[model samples]
Target: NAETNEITVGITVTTTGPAAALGIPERNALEFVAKEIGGHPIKMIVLDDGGDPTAATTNARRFVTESKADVIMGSSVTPPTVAVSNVANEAQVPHIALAPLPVTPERAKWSVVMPQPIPIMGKVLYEHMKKNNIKTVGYIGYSDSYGDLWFNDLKKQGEAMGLKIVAEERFARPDTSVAGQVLKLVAANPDAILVGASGTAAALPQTALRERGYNGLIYQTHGAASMDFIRIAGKSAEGVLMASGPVMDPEGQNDSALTKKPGLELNTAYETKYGPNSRSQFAGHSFDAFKVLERVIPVALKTAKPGTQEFREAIRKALLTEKDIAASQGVYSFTETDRYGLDDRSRILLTVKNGKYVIVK
Candidate 1:
């Protein structure tokens, strides 16, 4: 007989590899939220994917077959998240991904994502560039799914805004240098440069550009919204702009009415539990997943008992029905076709100043 009063939540994140800067905070956030969920004890099984898709798939299978997790979450970067989604779809389990990835038509029935879509972030960046009269921009990003997704959206959105992509380049996440790539981009003399790498790896392009004396404006994607990036890039990170969640501003500056309350609440809770200035968008998105689960699980319990396949199906159904729920990241409202429910209100433009993140006025 299974325990109906408890639910198992399986989590996979890259806590020890190149993407650890993003995954460690996410893991911490989930652990904090797990302490209490609708008065039901949560049995969390956390596995370190080490930023490897193969490890993520193995972890997902173990969660489903051995741990019997009622709900699954994470695998902190896009590639691994997609890997986990495949396993979740095959096992008929509901997966809430911490990273933003394309949820294929086949996985849409069982997969939901936490981060705002790449298209949404791209549009935001394009709008900021248009406001600043930037006509041509250079692009450089990771040589993986994250890079490919951002590059496609940046072109799509930039063209619509009359901004041309003058140059494009790529680098592996573990690469130590991007000097050659930076040299090509600088020669093009674009008005701005956008680096699409995540975590501390994003610093590679930023540092190389500065060292090569390319003083044009610089921008990054939301994936680089971690203190580790600032620490690694140091002065190179200064004045760089990017799109991020409202939780980036604990003081609620420039935050929309929809996200202010929940964003502050979560920020306060996280900082209180961890330490001052510990809130990151990576953690904020994972915390939002808990918020979604808190609302959906009780509704799922009304239809089926825990530790059963019917219960997982009910949870998936309830998630799709969620509407107007404010979370640390955004106002979430899901539908069958849209797995990531964030809109323009979920993103805000931010810049680094004096070695810290500040809202762009």
Candidate 2:
């Protein structure tokens, strides 16, 4: 019955530009999930988006209309995920979004966003600051939607937490020097400076701030939570705080039979295939997205007939109604009132120690 009910799934990823840092690993993780399924009567179709929103839409259209994918997953950042979501909504196909910062109102109806939204990172940071008695905080971020979303969220949450915003500034993604912004922030006499950006843009500001002798504390959103940032910033990243999704046990660290015998292994196989350090939440989201489909496809084939609309609805309902499907990125499930596979409450605190991110409290 499982063999007769075979279905195809599609996976999209960014292979170029800044988003590639996230998307390439996500692609690898999805492939690893596929290999783990072991002839589960599913064929996976993977595509590349070139890290462009327009390219993402083009890929989504092709995957739905041409590839005839039952479901699709991917795009590494918000813009491309937004592009894919629109096309998938129009096509009436489910697109599982694994991109970062996918918290826009438009995305709420179109697809399931797997990661905790960027705005929630701000709230988490605000809580951390309040717990530590940090009052006057500085703000420096990129000038894009990614930056604006977190900055706005941080401002709102910080205000609610009675934290005073002493300084606010912006930096272009390409331009590296943020000394002026750091100086401006320092002049405000804030207790700490929070950075709401990613890639080199996010790293430079933190380094500049530390170089300028501001040692209170540095708070970063999910965007800049990578070890790559800390690796680039060297000692400057030490004591920097960030909010992100929880990390999994890397390959071979656990002794559970599910992990040891490959009954339900997620991160272990992923790292073995992708590299040793393939442990980011971005990759984990893609892995979890595929696992969601892997579980739903078999169920859909069993109960819902092939040519009926009920079949499609069954898949969606199965996804939204299922509870605690164990995944490499943790449990995958949703409620009747919610579509997001994960929530704000899922985030955790991370801090840079000796230039690497380690869980803090």
CA lDDT of each prediction against the hidden true structure: 0.88, 0.69
TM-score of each: 0.96, 0.84
For each of the candidates, the C-alpha root-mean-square deviation to the true structure, in angstroms, is: 1.7, 4.0
> Evaluated with lDDT, which candidate comes out highest?
1
User: Runs in model 2 with CA error above 4 Å?
Assistant: 1-6, 35-40, 100-106, 199-201, 248-264, 273-277, 303-311, 341-345
lDDT of 2 by residue, 1-361 (tens): 1122445567778767765667766776656665423244566777888767788888888877777766767777767777888787777776788765443455544477776666656777888888888989888987766677777876787788899888889986557588788889878878888887764456788888888888788888776655567667888888888887654333322544222223135456766766665467666777777667767766776676532445555677777756766554445566544566555335678887775667776
Candidate 1 is scored at a TM of 0.96
Question: Residue 280 of candidate 2: its Cα lDDT?
Answer: 71
Give the per-residue lDDT digits (tens) of candidate 1, residues 1-361: 2646778889999999789999999988865675656677888898999989999999999998899999999989999999999999999999999998888898899998889898888888888899999999999998888999988887887888899999999998778888889999999999999889899898889888999999999999999987888989999998999888878875755554767776787777888998877789899988888888888988988888888898999999998786877787888888999999888778888998899888986
